[PDB]
Amino acid sequence: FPTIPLSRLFDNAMLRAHRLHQLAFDTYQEFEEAYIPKEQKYSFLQNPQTSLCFSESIPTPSNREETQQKSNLELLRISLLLIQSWLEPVQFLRSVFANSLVYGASDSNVYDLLKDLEERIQTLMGRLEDGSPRTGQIFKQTYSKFDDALLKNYGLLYCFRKDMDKVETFLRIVQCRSVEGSCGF
């Protein structure tokens, strides 16, 4: 037989990721402009001993071009992983979320939101498995793990947001070139 349209699995994955991201983004924004002035931002960033995140060991691309030469499987392997990496860590952010003012910010609500999207991607990997040789290094790599507070937290918030954008961006690069007319005219 041929193959069933994936435009429902994508619309359902792409909503979920877009949500995780919209959550990540707003909580960061909130935290940052209460306990982190430009002062602490640059210091933090200037010190990879704070600006560097655990999820930077699973090699992602860094610009349209390099990313637009990544086989579908590949892109979906990377996003599967970033999602898994944040599976435990989110545990922490918990209060921050359930202490924020975003309708939907909560440790649980997010964990489930991550376990949900996680299953969604594997499924597309099985189906939307677009040629791409399932034999490579990123394919052989498991996810990533995590080890004052104010900083520590804003550090995680920095990376959650950084990463959720990666995930949400890699999916759409798959969506557009797999479900025609979806990023239409």
Partner 1 sequence: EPKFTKCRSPERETFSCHWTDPIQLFYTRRNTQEWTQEWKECPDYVSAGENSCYFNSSFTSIWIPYCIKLTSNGGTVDEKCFSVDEIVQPDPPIALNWTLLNVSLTGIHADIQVRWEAPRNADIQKGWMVLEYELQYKEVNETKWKMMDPILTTSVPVYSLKVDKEYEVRVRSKQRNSGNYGEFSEVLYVTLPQMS
Contacting partner 1 (CB under 8 A), which of 27, 58, 89, 166?
Answer: 166
- For position 12 contacting partner 1 by CB under 8 A, the verdict is yes
Residue among 166, 151, 168, 173 at smallest CA distance from 55: 166
Query: Which residue stretch of 42-50, 91-99, 127-135, 139-147 sits at the interface with partner 1 (rule: CB under 8 A)?
Result: 42-50
Tell whether 168 is in a known binding site. yes
Contacting partner 1 (CB under 8 A), which of 51, 71, 100, 153?
Answer: 51
Inter-axis angle of helices 9-35 and 107-127, nearest 10 = 140
User: To the nearest whole angstrom, how small is the minimum distance from the Cβ of residue 148 to partner 1?
Assistant: 21
Query: Which residue stretch of 45-53, 82-90, 92-100, 133-141 sits at the interface with partner 1 (rule: CB under 8 A)?
Result: 45-53
Q: Looking only at residues 53 through 112 of this chain, which bind partner 1 when binding is defined by CB under 8 A? A: 60, 62-65, 67-68
Closer CB to partner 1, 14 or 96, in the complex = 14
Contacts 24+ apart (CB under 8 A), 144-151: 144/54, 144/55, 144/57, 144/58, 144/81, 144/85, 145/54, 145/85, 145/88, 146/54, 146/88, 146/89, 146/92, 147/54, 150/35, 150/36, 151/40, 151/44, 151/50
Tell whether 21 is in a known binding site. no
- For position 137 contacting partner 1 by CB under 8 A, the verdict is no
CB atoms within 10 A of CB 147: 5
Distance of CA 27 to the CA centre of its chain: 15
User: To the nearest whole angstrom, how small is the minimum distance from the Cβ of residue 119 to partner 1?
Assistant: 13
Q: Looking only at residues 144 through 163 of this chain, which bind partner 1 when binding is defined by CB under 8 A? A: 162
Annotation: binding site for Zn(2+): 18, 168
Interface ranges with partner 1 (CB under 8 A): 8, 11-12, 14-16, 18-19, 21-22, 25, 29, 41-42, 45-46, 48, 51-52, 60, 62-65, 67-68, 113, 116, 162, 165-166, 168-169, 172-177, 181-185
